[PDB]
């Protein structure tokens, strides 16, 4: 039925790159774009193994409760099927942390007892195998509501990181 | 907590006739005690204008939370300058009646000396009500979760069954997968921070790299096309490509962490489990063998009346360390 | 700037080729100086040099007023014999050594009596003299400022000239295939290097490996559509055509002397007269005083 | 087009007043930090106030070229919080600093080793510096291609987004 082509590998690489870009976009005005790039119709999205239903509320809680980081991508998967619209990748992502002691919105941690930002204070990174099962119609740029499964699970988090999960 | 103040006015220690190297080795003694747990310290007026004898205390007592060091006799900040990212979780410090605490920098540099401070000398220098949700996580994590409890039960059952079968003999990959059920396999070269506990330094999986269908690893198309998975024959090729490893999930069921969900597009259900895979034996097909290495299966099985049939068959080599399940 | 008058007075400059860095005069003396009772007999040396693009081989003797070339050969003259790609490797060095050897022996008249080592097997063989008649033309290798390592292309050109048929005295331990742990040679490595086997090994290995570096590095062989198992036949046909037609032919220039001279002179600059220099100094004085 | 001001050398050195187990300790530290084996260095002359005789080892050092150079440099700037002080910059266009308490460099808190310090020194150049390092036809660098203080300060102020005080 199926085969082994470079289309699924290029799709996995481009999806990992676009996912890293959309997760490093720290502003709140693009939090609708994450749900619109994922399956806004129906999906299964568990990020850090959380019982989440819709991606919109999760992206809103992300832009209100998470800052930016870096994502070192080191491995991808490419599994495809016929008559089911299957395309499965697994980004081996080393995801960093943000030592701003707040969310993305550039807060002031000091309780005011009486500008330009600081240096990009980062912390230790955690390894994860973020699995994305999406639909393989994107060989000619069709990626509108295709990601049926978004499973973020981790492997190892260093003790030097600021935020503790 | 332990108090180490006024030891030069205690007859149990004054007549013993002995201080700097004594306290710098008493840090080692208190670290090798390991059963007399003390979090904070009380060593006010320790007869030092500098902080030499209390320098290794930040490394030896890394669970510091508070310190009262008043009536000090310090007139500098360079002795305390080494305390950046060292006892930085402590939340209380005051060494007043001194030229180190009555200066100007006591409100602008003390927060740098202890960023995680929820208090500052019987006050609050930061929003301590919101710091527990801003400087840390907002909620906890789930070491095992799914869309439903019975869904997690059946997912863990099929995951442990597949792991036990791949441990015993994976020769029936052709009988486990259908004509459409394909696979994928890759390896994780780069690693995390070096201070990660029991962390593999490098992926010592040098007998599985040629059949790794990873996108950003190799730059070619035909190479990933040959290393990628067809049906049952190439599925068994990927099954006997790597080193056979008995599942280290029954030892640490906690560190064997599995999430799960469904698949609405095919009335299926998915499970992403991750555990260790220690390989005593290897692949018989022709630095060489494995090391401490983990594995993670992201399967998508569609059930029936008889059994479940897989749709995705993933293999991930990684760098083994501790898991995100424990507290 | 350390520019004292006393320093620049007492400073002694070195020789011109020493200041520009092109002649080791120690080795030059020990190489050029002749036995005084062989009165007017020239010591002939084989100068072999490597640029970034070319190999030069030259037979030089020395006089009082300057050196004299007896014969010469270049690596960029190989496309009339074969090789168009890889013009500065070990196999090209072997080829240009063989070419200058056959050219010099033909120019003297000893080509039909010192045939060299045909059917090369990569062994060690000095050109032995004949029982009757003359004895072979002897040359001394001159390598200049290049370091002596095992596996170098200067000794590749050395083996090429000696198998061409010149007597050049040498040992074997700088040949690629020498084992320092056994003090012996393995001549199959010499055979594969003389026929260019390491480039073919890399071509096959990178063809199995990533083809981006293959299509970047060996793109000329893909454009010429020559398979990796044809390099030995290329080297063999080049050896046959070198031993067939050894004589030199010029480049048949269009840039004749007067035309090239007038064009290069129109492009390049010239000097200025002291009259105009004194006028410029007078203008400098007038603009400084007004 | 060619003038670029890239990283030529990152040299890490640890100097030890003793000649005990501390040199083997710092040798293992440098072999764990850099990906290469280090080199111990003999004392030049005798002092008797530092307690030093000649021909016995004092210090350890190692040189790093390539991407690991700017990796180590980014870690050292993270320790130094991206601040230099308008000293630490030579007229010839090299720059360095020194780090106390090397635990904040990925090095763990092992008591079998303990605490050391380090000196990092960065040598800068431009392409075409082979002319002063080759053997045949050695030359110099012309007086427009040399790396100078203002060139290094401006280029590695605008990259790494650092600050140079005073």
Using CA atoms, how far residue C37 sits from C31, C40, C41, in Å, is 17, 9, 9
CA–CA distance, C52 with A17 (Å, rounded to integer)? 42
Whether residue A90 contacts residue A131, with contact meaning beta carbons closer than 8 Å, is answered with yes
CA–CA distance, B215 with C104 (Å, rounded to integer)? 59
- Which residues in chain A belong to E strands, given as ranges? 44-47, 71-73, 79-80, 87-95, 126-134, 149-152, 154-156
What sign for the dihedral angle of Cα D17, D20, D21, D23? positive
Using CA atoms, how far residue B44 sits from B4, B65, B69, B122, B241, in Å, is 8, 16, 4, 16, 65
What sign for the dihedral angle of Cα B14, B18, B20, B22? negative
Chain C residue with CA closest to D140: the answer is C20
Using CA atoms, how far residue A165 sits from B10, C244, C257, in Å, is 45, 81, 83
- Tell me which long-range contacts B15-20 makes (C-beta under 8 A, separation of at least 24): B19/B47, B19/B53, B20/B48, B20/B52, B20/B53
Q: Which residues contact D111 (CB under 8 A, 6 or more apart)?
A: B28, B31
In chain B, alpha helices (H)? 11-14, 22-33, 57-60, 110-113, 128-134, 149-168, 173-176, 222-227, 232-239
Instruction: Say what the resolution is, in angstroms.
Output: 2.6
Whether residue B212 contacts residue A74, with contact meaning beta carbons closer than 8 Å, is answered with no
Chains A and B, touching by 3 or more CB pairs within 8 angstroms? yes
Chains A and C, touching by 3 or more CB pairs within 8 angstroms? no
For residue D94, the distance in angstroms to the closest alpha carbon of chain A comes to: 24
CA–CA distance, C49 with C55 (Å, rounded to integer)? 6
Residue B294: strand pairing partners? B276
Q: How was this structure determined?
A: cryo-EM
Q: What are the residue ranges spanned by the domains of chain B? A: 1-134, 135-327
Of D101, D108, D109, which is closest to B82 when you measure between CB atoms?
A: D101
- Going along chain A from its start, the domains and CATH numbers come out as 7-159 (3.10.450.50)
Query: A143 is written with which tokens?
Result: 């990626």
Of B147, B188, B296, which is closest to A44 when you measure between CB atoms?
A: B147
Q: Which residues contact A139 (CB under 8 A, 6 or more apart)?
A: A7, A11
Residue for token digits 């600021």? Answer: A162
Cβ of B214 within 8 Å of Cβ of A77? The answer is yes
**Partner B contacted by A105 (CB < 8 A):** no
CA–CA distance, B322 with B327 (Å, rounded to integer)? 11
Binding-site residues on chain B for chain C (CB distance < 8 A): 218-220, 223
CA–CA distance, D96 with D121 (Å, rounded to integer)? 4
Q: Produce one character per residue of B2-35: b if its CB has 16 or more CB atoms within 10 Å, e if not.
A: eebbebeeeeeeeeeeeeeeebbebbeebbeeee
10 Å CB burial of residue D67 (0-12, 13-18, 19+) is exposed
> DSSP 3-state assignment of C106?
helix
Whether residue C198 contacts residue C177, with contact meaning beta carbons closer than 8 Å, is answered with no
Query: D30 is written with which tokens?
Result: 């440098």
Enumerate the residues of chain A whose CB falls inside 8 A of the CB of residue B183.
79
**Partner A contacted by D161 (CB < 8 A):** yes
Residue C184: strand pairing partners? C179
Query: CA torsion, points B214, A149, B171, B287, in degrees to nearest 10?
Result: 30
Residue for token digits 């009380």? Answer: B42
Cβ of D136 within 8 Å of Cβ of C144? The answer is yes
Q: Which residues contact C167 (CB under 8 A, 6 or more apart)?
A: C126, C127, C136, C137, C138, C139
In 3D space, the residue among A58, A28, A33 whose CA is nearest the CA of residue A45 turns out to be A58
Q: Which helix (H) or strand (E) holds C142?
A: strand C140-142
Whether residue C238 contacts residue C78, with contact meaning beta carbons closer than 8 Å, is answered with yes
> DSSP 3-state assignment of C288?
helix
* Chain centroid to CA C71: 12
- Bin B271: left if φ > 0, else alpha if -120 < ψ < 50, else beta: beta
Chain C residue with CA closest to D139: the answer is C20
Chain B residue with CA closest to D111: the answer is B28
Q: Which residues contact B213 (CB under 8 A, 6 or more apart)?
A: A4, A9, A77, A78, B184, B185, B186, B224, B227, B228, B229
């Amino acid at each position: 039925m199926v085969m082994n082509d470079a289309n699924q590998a290029q799709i996995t690489a481009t999806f990992t790159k676009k996912i890293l870009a959309h997760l490093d976009d720290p502003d709140s005005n693009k939090l609708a774009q994450f749900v619109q790039l994922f399956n806004p119709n129906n999906c299964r999205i568990i990020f850090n193994a959380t019982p989440f239903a819709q991606a919109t509320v999760f992206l809103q809680m992300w832009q209100n409760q998470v800052v930016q980081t870096q994502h070192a991508l080191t491995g991808v998967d490419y599994h495809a099927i016929p008559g089911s619209g299957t395309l499965i990748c697994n980004v081996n992502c080393k995801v960093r942390f943000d030592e701003s002691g707040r969310d993305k919105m550039g807060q002031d941690a000091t309780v005011p007892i009486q500008m330009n930002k600081p240096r990009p204070l980062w912390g230790p990174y955690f390894g994860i195998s973020l699995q994305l099962i999406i639909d393989d119609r994107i060989f000619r740029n069709d990626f509108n509501g295709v990601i049926s499964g978004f499973n973020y699970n981790m492997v190892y988090k260093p003790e030097d990181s600021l935020l503790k999960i | 907590l332990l108090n180490l103040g006024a030891l030069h006015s205690d007859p149990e220690l004054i007549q013993k006739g002995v201080q700097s190297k004594m306290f710098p080795a008493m840090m080692k003694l208190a670290s090798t005690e390991k059963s007399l747990i003390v979090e904070s310290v009380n060593l006010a007026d320790n007869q030092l204008k500098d902080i030499s004898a209390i320098s290794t205390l930040a490394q030896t007592f890394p669970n510091l939370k508070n310190l009262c060091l008043a009536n000090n006799q310090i007139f500098r900040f360079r002795s305390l300058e080494v305390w950046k990212n060292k006892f930085k979780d402590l939340r209380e410090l005051l060494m007043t009646n001194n030229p180190i605490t009555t200066d100007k920098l006591y409100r602008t540099e003390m927060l740098r000396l202890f960023p995680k401070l929820v208090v500052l000398d019987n006050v609050i220098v930061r929003d301590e009500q919101k710091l527990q949700t801003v400087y840390s996580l907002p909620m906890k994590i789930q070491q095992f979760f799914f869309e439903n409890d019975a869904l997690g039960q059946s997912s863990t059952d099929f995951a442990t069954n597949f792991l036990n079968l791949w441990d015993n003999n994976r020769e029936q990959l052709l009988n486990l997968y259908s004509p459409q059920s394909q696979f994928s396999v890759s390896v994780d070269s780069t690693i995390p921070p070096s201070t990660v506990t029991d962390s593999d330094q490098t992926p010592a999986f040098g007998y599985y790299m040629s059949s790794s269908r990873n996108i950003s690893k190799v730059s070619s198309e035909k190479s990933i096309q040959q290393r990628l998975s067809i049906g049952q024959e190439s599925i068994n090729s990927i099954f006997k490509t790597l080193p056979k490893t008995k599942h280290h999930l029954q030892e640490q069921p906690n560190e064997y962490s599995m999430e799960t969900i469904s698949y609405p597009q095919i009335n299926g259900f998915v499970i992403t489990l991750h555990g260790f895979f220690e390989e005593t034996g290897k692949p018989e097909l022709e630095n060489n063998k494995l090391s401490k290495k983990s594995f993670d299966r992201t399967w998508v099985i569609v059930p029936m009346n008889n059994s479940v049939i897989i749709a995705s068959d993933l293999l991930t080599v990684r760098a083994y360390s501790t898991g995100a399940w424990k507290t | 700037d350390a520019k004292s008058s006393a320093y620049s007075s007492r400073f002694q400059t070195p020789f011109r080729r020493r200041r520009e860095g092109k002649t080791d005069y120690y080795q030059r003396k020990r190489l050029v100086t002749q036995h005084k009772a062989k009165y007017n007999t020239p010591k002939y040396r084989l100068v072999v040099r490597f640029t970034n693009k070319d190999i030069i081989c030259q037979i030089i003797s020395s006089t009082i007023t300057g050196d004299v070339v007896l014969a010469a050969a270049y690596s960029h003259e190989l496309p009339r014999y074969g090789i168009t790609h890889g013009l500065t490797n070990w196999a090209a060095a072997y080829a240009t050594g063989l070419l200058i050897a056959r050219r010099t022996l033909q120019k003297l008249g000893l080509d039909e009596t010192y045939k060299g080592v045909e059917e090369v097997e990569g062994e060690y063989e000095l050109t032995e003299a004949v029982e009757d008649g003359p004895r072979p033309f002897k040359v001394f290798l001159d390598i200049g400022l290049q370091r002596t390592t095992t596996g170098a292309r200067v000794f590749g050109a050395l083996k090429g000239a000696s198998d061409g048929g010149l007597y050049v005295p040498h040992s074997e331990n700088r040949f690629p295939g020498w084992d320092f742990e056994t003090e012996e040679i393995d001549p199959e490595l010499l055979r594969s290097y003389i026929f260019g086997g390491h480039v073919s090994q890399y071509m096959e290995e990178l063809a199995d490996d990533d083809e981006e570096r293959f299509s970047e590095l060996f793109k000329g062989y893909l454009a010429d559509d020559i398979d990796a198992d044809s390099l030995e036949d290329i080297y063999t046909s080049a050896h046959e055509a070198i031993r067939a037609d050894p004589a030199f032919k010029p480049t048949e220039k269009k840039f004749t002397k007067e035309q090239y001279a007038a064009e290069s002179k129109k492009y390049r600059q010239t000097k200025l007269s002291k009259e105009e220099r004194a006028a410029r100094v007078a203008a400098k004085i007038a603009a400084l005083a007004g | 087009p060619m003038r670029d001001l890239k990283i030529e050398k990152l040299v890490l050195n640890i100097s030890v007043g003793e000649s005990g187990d501390r040199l083997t300790r710092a040798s293992k530290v440098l072999e764990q930090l850099s990906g290469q084996t280090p080199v111990q260095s003999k004392a030049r002359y005798t002092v008797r106030t530092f307690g030093i005789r000649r021909n016995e080892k004092i210090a350890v050092h190692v040189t790093v070229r390539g991407p690991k150079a700017e990796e180590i440099l980014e870690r050292g700037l993270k320790v130094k919080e991206y601040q230099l002080r308008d000293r630490n910059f030579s007229a010839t266009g090299n720059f360095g600093f020194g780090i106390d308490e090397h635990i904040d460099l990925g090095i763990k808190y092992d008591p079998s080793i303990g605490i050391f310090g380090m000196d990092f020194y960065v040598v800068m150049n431009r392409p075409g510096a082979r002319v002063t390092r080759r053997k045949r036809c050695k030359g110099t660098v012309g007086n427009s291609h040399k790396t100078t203080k203002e060139d290094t300060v401006s280029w590695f102020k605008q990259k790494y987004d650092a600050d140079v005080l005073d």
